[PDB]
Amino acid sequence: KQSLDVSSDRRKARKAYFTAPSSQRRVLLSAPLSKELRAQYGIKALPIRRDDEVLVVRGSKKGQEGKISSVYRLKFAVQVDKVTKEKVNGASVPINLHPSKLVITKLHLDKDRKALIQRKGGKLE
């Protein structure tokens, strides 16, 4: 740190993350892109929105993939389709995944995402 207006205080940084509102939890819950998607666009990592398809890279659920169901901002998680735990009773419940342990294999493209990609400097849509 050389800029004095930023803080290297563990206490402040912990609170600033946990009490981050919805709009900044968008940016905190970001995921890196696949080797193929990074070769296509030329962008490292994006904020996970709802219907992007991803691959799991860490954890017990490593290797599984599919579309993300719920960007559960309030729990700092993203629940992915087909990656679920069946309870003892036989009712399924989605497993809470952190988006930085995933990889964006397929992008959900709308006008605001094309705008975001062009802004960072992507050489397509």
Partner RNA sequence: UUAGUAACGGCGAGUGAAGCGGCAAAAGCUCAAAUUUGAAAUCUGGUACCUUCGGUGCCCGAGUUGUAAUUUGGAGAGGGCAACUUUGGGGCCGUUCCUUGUCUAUGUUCCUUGGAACAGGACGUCAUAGAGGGUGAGAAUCCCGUGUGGCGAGGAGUGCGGUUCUUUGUAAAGUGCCUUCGAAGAGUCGAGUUGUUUGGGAAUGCAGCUCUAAGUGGGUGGUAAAUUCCAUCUAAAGCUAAAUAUUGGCGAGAGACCGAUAGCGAACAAGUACAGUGAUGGAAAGAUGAAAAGAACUUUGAAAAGAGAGUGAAAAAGUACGUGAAA
Partner RNA sequence: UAUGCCGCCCGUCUUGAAACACGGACCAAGGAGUCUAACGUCUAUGCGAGUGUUUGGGUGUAAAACCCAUACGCGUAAUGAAAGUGAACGUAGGUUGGGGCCUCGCAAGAGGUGCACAAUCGACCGAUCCUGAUGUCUUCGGAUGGAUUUGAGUAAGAGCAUA
Partner RNA sequence: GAGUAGGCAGGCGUGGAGGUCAGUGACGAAGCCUAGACCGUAAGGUCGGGUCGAACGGCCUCUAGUGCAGAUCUUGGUGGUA
Residue 111 interacts with RNA (CB under 7 A): yes or no: no
The nearer residue to RNA, 70 or 95, going by C-beta atoms, is: 95
Contact call for residues 30 and 73 (beta carbons, < 8 A): no
Residue 90 interacts with RNA (CB under 7 A): yes or no: yes
Beta-sheet strands, E only, within the chain: 30-32, 45-47, 53-56, 65-70, 78-86, 92-97, 102-106
Residue 5 interacts with RNA (CB under 7 A): yes or no: yes
Residue 74 interacts with RNA (CB under 7 A): yes or no: no
Residue 109 interacts with RNA (CB under 7 A): yes or no: no
